[PDB]
């Protein structure tokens, strides 16, 4: 938010996003490759 | 791989909803809807990989797609969401651990203070009653916050199921956060009526304080619950990119502003009383003492955010240490009761 | 007025008669005593409900009912067994300083800055409690009162006088004069025919309720005597003064026997009361604490901590089972 | 180039016999073969000067997806903000209620 | 025993109504048949002022009963038996009494060779003399106030505050200031 | 009169302290058993525990 | 027993000197605060001077400030009042007073009638 109280909800969202380690660790190298997507 | 499953599932959904200016296309990760020429459609980075943050928004340009040099083909940059992630994960983990340890220490201190207040019946005035209520609201808020953070946000296996238990937990968590931030307003109202107003002690009915601390926070909680159930019904109500959280964070801000006004009036009355009798010493001392009780730390860069996070997640410990562990009356009773064991 | 020379020569004869009658202090012949050690008494009950500071209390003869006088203008009767309030008597004068429980349990008295000992009927056929008689005639504040029967009661007043009252007629049948300071407390003997008195002149006098004469006079204290209480045998009594010490006097010896004091205790005594045996001397002090003194060895055998304000009164039950301790924190504590 | 994609396209069209008519839109069943077909199209590309997303792919895969599985809704979840007229009153009513309740408690406790 | 709790419920219900009228009443002791009571009420705030009647001049015992009052109204007569200095010693004993260190004192006021420090004494310009008043009258009046204030500021230990005054509104505004300072000290603010 | 009161306080047939000190001490020794404050027996029959 | 027997006094011409002494007994002289009280013929009792238990804090009345001095010998349990340059206004019975509360800053009920803990009084006639 622009307030200071939403840090609990923003932190909950950050945990929901940045804890799934079952997916790929490093992003596949098609993005960093200009001859790709 | 489940990430590749998500990739092909997004492709499936998008290229089914096709039949349901740069022409319609599919980059490989996101659906690019056809728009008029001369404009750039920027979409948000997906949730496929660890190095991709769902916070940053990727770009895509059309003037006939983009002409990447040395490629001469359609291309779009995903640079803003591939970098600046590996230490944001670091600070996310650090803030999570700081929150849980601060809430645990606050729970311990507040329960100890509640035990002291309930064992020493000599302190049974309305001030002490409101202190018990505020401490109990703090305890419940911190407990439900730890429960929602360690069992809903950190484990996506239950969020993928999308049950009714996690949404009910979110509702209870928002309601108890409202209670925690409204008992601060109740304490501020009591202080303003005692100091600024000529209200006697042990006089008022004290029921409206209970209704405002425990009954009123149900209104914004239920409003936000129905609003998300009808407009933003996502999984477990964990998304923080919606404006419906303002339904909860508005009354909190209003109560904190009213508490700031009450604090200003209280320090004004105090400095006025100090005129007949330095002045700045106690004038700032009382303010720093009443800041954690009234919760005036949200109306305000490298470490300021961490200091603010500490001030919020260690507020229960601060209030329990100031108003119970350093209180003159409680301390004196403890020291002269220490002669038993 | 040089008969003062005769008065000073006569008090020397009395002082020399006390020196000849003293072979050894009571504390001297005490080595044949098994020490009682540390008496650890705990708060078994805490009667709450009073609004202001509690000034006095008195146990009933049944050792279950007790009356308490607080300066908020209320006379509450407590059942010490179940903490239940039997009666809540509102007083006309809120400045009550003493309260008494009749031996028959049918009446309760109280008094204070109004110089009136109000009698209340507890066994009305209607069922309610109202004033029976207003004993007026004292020109000073009422400090203590004790019932002799349903119709007789002695009162102590701040006008340096004590009076015996007739509850039926409302007349003072005997007035006891001789004190020079404000009388603070009285206490009847077990035979209720004699009673000692403590005033604000560091002196205690022995009185006869019938003839109305001052039998004996006991000195030795240095400040105002605040409380007094008889021994269970009626042959001695203890005194609490502002000089931060307790002293036990003797009737047939006419001399001070013991002095209960310590260097760390520099605050006076607000109340005194002996147990059923008389072995312990309980005393309420101004340091918000109560100290149990060994009446024979003068060594403190226990401390009663827990009160957050000045202790005013102290009462031991007739059977010696419990001790009610009132204080300025509007609380009553029962100890065992 | 485009003629090579016909091989894997017909392979998938023959491989659709695994799912039944009642399970034509059976999701968790055929996405493995769909990924195999996307890799098929990628392999058919990269031989004439085209990447994996190609206009010829945009013209072939549409028919590849439309030939068998039609008239089946995706049933996607829509997660967006309100139309901004039913949001701001729903936000400013709690604030007014809070200030009104605070004033009411103050006014009641004052007397 | 069951019927006994019925009477205890009836009594505690009455005690709750008696607490509402006791905690909302300012009790005052007037110094200067045993005790005369006066219930006056200002701005619908109830005051209960007590005037000691038929009592002896020895006050060191019955003065402890007024340790919890809001304020002791100490009236002084600015005077030959030197009555003013006798009130100074009485105000001195009241101000430094162990049980009145938290009891404020509202000091109500109303010579030449009985105070040698009056010769070399200057009028503090912070004073507010009333219009049409002789300056030497102002010096003699505020000199007596300084004698009582010198005793009031010689002992910082205690919650008692001395409010000197030179009639019912003065007591009302002073009691409001006393309960305000009482509330700030409960929160460790003052 | 202060003199007449002291004159009647000098005609007292007093006894000596060693006799009276042995009587108050023997009273507390023979009555120590009936005081529960000195001898705390089990609280099975105590109406406050 | 608090006796507080005083000494001194007599007839002295105006402008002379005199020294009064208290003979305290029955209590500890070092723990109590001492006072001087005089009673003029036809007038009430009035406080003259007091001295703290230690001996540092000292106060007099305005009529005697600068002329009379207070002193106490805690080792001898006595109190002295050296009177210098007496006036015919000082002709009164001087009582040696002692308020009953020890260890206290307050000194109550001095200069009062029917008040114990005070001596019989010595007559200083000028």
Coordinates of N, CA and C in Angstrom, one line a residue, chain E residues 56-61 63 80-82 85 89-90 92-98 100-101 113-117 155 157 160, chain G residues 33 35 43-47 50 59-63 65 89 100 104-117:
Chain E
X56 N -10.8 18.9 69.8 CA -9.8 19.6 70.5 C -8.7 20.0 69.6
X57 N -7.8 20.9 70.1 CA -6.8 21.5 69.2 C -5.7 20.5 68.8
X58 N -5.7 19.3 69.4 CA -4.7 18.3 69.0 C -5.1 17.6 67.8
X59 N -4.5 17.9 66.7 CA -5.0 17.4 65.4 C -4.1 16.3 64.8
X60 N -3.0 15.9 65.5 CA -2.1 14.9 64.9 C -2.7 13.5 64.8
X61 N -3.9 13.3 65.2 CA -4.6 12.0 65.1 C -5.7 11.9 64.1
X63 N -6.4 14.1 61.8 CA -6.1 14.7 60.5 C -5.7 13.6 59.5
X80 N -1.5 41.0 70.1 CA -0.9 40.4 68.9 C -0.1 39.1 69.4
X81 N -0.8 38.0 69.2 CA -0.2 36.7 69.6 C 0.5 36.0 68.4
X82 N 0.8 36.8 67.3 CA 1.5 36.2 66.1 C 0.7 35.0 65.6
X85 N 2.2 33.3 62.1 CA 3.3 32.3 62.2 C 2.9 31.0 62.8
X89 N 3.6 27.2 61.0 CA 4.0 25.9 61.6 C 2.9 24.8 61.4
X90 N 1.7 25.2 61.4 CA 0.6 24.2 61.2 C 0.6 23.8 59.7
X92 N 3.3 23.9 58.0 CA 4.5 23.1 57.9 C 4.3 21.7 58.3
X93 N 3.6 21.5 59.4 CA 3.4 20.1 59.9 C 2.4 19.3 58.9
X94 N 1.5 20.0 58.3 CA 0.6 19.4 57.4 C 1.3 19.0 56.1
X95 N 2.1 19.9 55.6 CA 2.8 19.7 54.3 C 3.8 18.5 54.4
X96 N 4.5 18.4 55.6 CA 5.5 17.3 55.8 C 4.9 16.2 56.6
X97 N 3.6 16.0 56.7 CA 3.1 14.9 57.4 C 3.1 13.6 56.5
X98 N 3.5 12.5 57.1 CA 3.7 11.3 56.3 C 2.5 10.8 55.5
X100 N 0.0 12.9 54.4 CA -0.5 14.0 53.6 C 0.4 14.4 52.6
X101 N 1.5 13.6 52.2 CA 2.4 14.0 51.2 C 1.8 13.9 49.8
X113 N 7.4 43.9 62.5 CA 8.5 43.6 63.4 C 8.6 42.2 63.8
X114 N 7.8 41.3 63.1 CA 7.7 39.9 63.4 C 8.4 39.1 62.3
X115 N 9.0 39.7 61.3 CA 9.7 39.1 60.2 C 10.8 40.0 59.7
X116 N 12.0 39.7 60.2 CA 13.1 40.6 59.7 C 13.5 40.5 58.2
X117 N 13.1 39.4 57.6 CA 13.4 39.2 56.2 C 12.5 40.1 55.3
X155 N 10.4 20.6 50.0 CA 10.3 19.1 50.1 C 9.7 18.7 48.8
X157 N 9.7 15.6 47.7 CA 9.1 14.3 47.8 C 7.7 14.4 48.2
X160 N 1.8 16.1 46.9 CA 1.0 17.3 47.3 C 1.5 18.5 46.5
Chain G
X33 N 12.7 15.9 67.4 CA 13.0 17.3 67.2 C 12.5 18.1 68.4
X35 N 11.7 21.9 70.4 CA 11.1 23.2 70.2 C 11.1 24.1 71.4
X43 N -1.7 36.0 77.3 CA -1.8 35.6 75.9 C -1.6 34.1 75.8
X44 N -1.8 33.6 74.5 CA -1.6 32.2 74.3 C -0.2 31.7 74.0
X45 N 0.0 30.4 73.9 CA 1.3 29.9 73.7 C 1.7 30.2 72.3
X46 N 3.1 30.4 72.1 CA 3.6 30.7 70.8 C 5.0 30.0 70.7
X47 N 5.3 29.6 69.4 CA 6.5 28.9 69.1 C 7.7 29.9 69.0
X50 N 12.9 26.1 66.9 CA 13.1 24.7 66.9 C 14.5 24.4 66.2
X59 N 15.5 27.1 62.8 CA 14.5 28.1 62.5 C 14.1 28.8 63.8
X60 N 13.9 30.1 63.7 CA 13.4 30.9 64.8 C 12.2 31.7 64.4
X61 N 11.5 32.3 65.4 CA 10.5 33.3 65.1 C 11.1 34.7 64.8
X62 N 10.4 35.5 64.1 CA 10.9 36.8 63.7 C 11.3 37.7 64.8
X63 N 10.6 37.6 66.0 CA 10.9 38.5 67.1 C 12.2 38.1 67.8
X65 N 14.8 36.3 65.9 CA 15.8 35.9 64.9 C 16.9 37.0 65.0
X89 N 9.6 42.7 76.0 CA 8.6 41.9 75.4 C 8.9 40.4 75.5
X100 N 5.6 14.5 69.4 CA 5.8 13.0 69.8 C 6.3 12.2 68.6
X104 N 10.5 12.1 62.0 CA 9.5 12.8 61.2 C 9.9 14.3 60.9
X105 N 9.6 14.8 59.7 CA 9.9 16.2 59.4 C 8.8 17.1 60.1
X106 N 7.6 16.5 60.2 CA 6.5 17.3 60.8 C 6.6 17.3 62.3
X107 N 6.2 18.4 62.9 CA 6.2 18.5 64.4 C 4.9 19.1 64.8
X108 N 4.0 18.2 65.2 CA 2.6 18.5 65.4 C 2.3 18.8 66.8
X109 N 1.2 19.6 67.0 CA 0.5 19.9 68.3 C 1.5 20.5 69.3
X110 N 2.6 21.1 68.9 CA 3.3 22.0 69.8 C 2.5 23.3 69.9
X111 N 2.9 24.0 71.0 CA 2.3 25.3 71.3 C 0.8 25.1 71.6
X112 N 0.3 24.0 72.1 CA -1.1 23.7 72.3 C -1.3 23.5 73.8
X113 N -2.6 23.8 74.2 CA -3.0 23.6 75.6 C -3.4 22.1 75.8
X114 N -3.3 21.7 77.1 CA -3.6 20.3 77.4 C -2.7 19.4 76.6
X115 N -1.5 19.8 76.3 CA -0.6 19.0 75.4 C 0.5 18.5 76.3
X116 N 0.7 17.2 76.3 CA 1.8 16.6 77.1 C 3.1 16.7 76.3
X117 N 4.1 16.0 76.8 CA 5.5 16.0 76.2 C 6.1 17.4 76.2

